[PDB]
DNA sequence: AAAAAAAAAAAAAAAAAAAAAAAAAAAAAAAAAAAAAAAAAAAAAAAAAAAAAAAAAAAAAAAAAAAAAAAAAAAAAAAAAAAAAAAAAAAAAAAAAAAAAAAAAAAAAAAAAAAAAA
C-alpha cells in the first residue's frame, strides 16, 4: 500500500535497487546464453533432467540430488526460472 | 617373475520392466461413393459475306470550372538504431550390404568292449 501511495520515493528506491543490480552484474565475467531443454526443443539432454527457463548462465542453478524420489521431491518444490535438477542413481 | 584388471564374499545407496482384465479415445491403413479429367461420336451458334444505312467526331466559339501561384500550418514517411522469424549450407547418422570366425552334420576307419561258438 505504501508503494502504491507514494510514487516519488518508490521511484527513487527502484532507481537505487537498479543501480545496485547493475553494479552486481558488472562483476560477472563474459558468457553466452545456452540452449535450454524445453517442450519444443530438447537439445540432446538427458530425459531425467528437469531444466530451467533461464537461457543465461550466471542466473541458473543445477541441483545434483541422490535419486529419483529426491528428484521428484525437489522438482515439485523449486523455481522453474532458475532451478534445474539432475537426479543421479 | 613384475604390473594390471576381474570376480566374489556382505551390509549399504539408488533404480528399471513384461503381462491380465474393460472402455474410451486417437492413429493409420484400407474399400468405395463421388466428382475432375480425358477420348471419341454427332451435332449447331458464330464468322463470314454482302448490301445497305445513319450517329458521333469535326468545326465555329463563348464561358465556367479549373491547375498554377501565394501563404499558413499539420504532421505522413524515410533512414538509422535495435530486436525477432524463418529458410539454405554443411555436417552427421542407423540400417544395411559385405566380409570373416565358430557350431552342427558328416561318414572312413579303428580301439575297446560285449557276446557267443567249439
Curated annotation (Swiss-Prot):
Quaternary state and interactors: Heterotetramer, composed of two GyrA and two GyrB chains. In the heterotetramer, GyrA contains the active site tyrosine that forms a transient covalent intermediate with the DNA, while GyrB binds cofactors and catalyzes ATP hydrolysis.
Name by which UniProt lists this protein: DNA gyrase subunit B
Family: Belongs to the type II topoisomerase family.
Outcome following mutation: residue 89 to E: In nal-31, nal-109, nal-115 and nal-120 mutants; resistant to nalidixic acid
Residues holding Mg(2+) 1: 66
Signal sequence bounds: none
Note: When the enzyme transiently cleaves DNA a phosphotyrosine bond is formed between GyrA and DNA in an ATP-independent manner. In the presence of quinolones this intermediate can be trapped and is used as an indicator of drug toxicity.
Complete-protein stretch covered: 359 to 447 of 804
Organism this protein belongs to: Escherichia coli (strain K12)
Cellular localization per UniProt: Cytoplasm
Purpose: DNA gyrase negatively supercoils closed circular double-stranded DNA in an ATP-dependent manner to maintain chromosomes in an underwound state. This makes better substrates for topoisomerase 4 (ParC and ParE) which is the main enzyme that unlinks newly replicated chromosomes in E.coli. Gyrase catalyzes the interconversion of other topological isomers of double-stranded DNA rings, including catenanes. Relaxes negatively supercoiled DNA in an ATP-independent manner.
Description of its domains: Consists of 3 domains; the ATPase domain (residues 1-220), the transducer domain (221-392) and the toprim domain (393-804). ATP-binding is cooperative, and both subunits must be wild-type at residue 103 for supercoiling to occur. Non-hydrolyzable ATP analogs (and ATP-binding) induce dimerization and enhance ATPase activity. ATP hydrolysis induces domain shifts that are probably part of the mechanism of DNA cleavage and rejoining.
Gene: gyrB
Impact after mutating residue 78 to S: Cannot be made, suggesting it is lethal. This is temperature-sensitive in S.typhimurium, but not lethal
Amino acid at each position: 500500500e505504501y508503494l502504491l501511495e507514494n510514487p516519488t520515493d518508490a521511484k527513487i528506491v527502484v532507481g537505487k535497487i537498479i543501480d545496485a543490480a547493475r553494479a552486481r552484474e558488472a562483476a560477472r565475467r563474459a558468457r553466452e546464453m545456452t540452449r535450454r531443454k524445453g517442450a519444443l526443443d530438447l537439445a540432446g539432454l538427458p530425459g531425467k533432467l528437469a531444466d530451467c527457463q533461464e537461457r543465461d548462465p550466471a542466473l541458473s542453478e543445477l541441483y545434483l540430488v541422490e535419486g529419483d524420489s529426491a528428484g521428484g521431491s525437489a522438482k515439485q518444490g523449486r523455481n522453474r526460472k532458475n532451478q534445474a535438477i539432475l537426479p543421479l542413481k
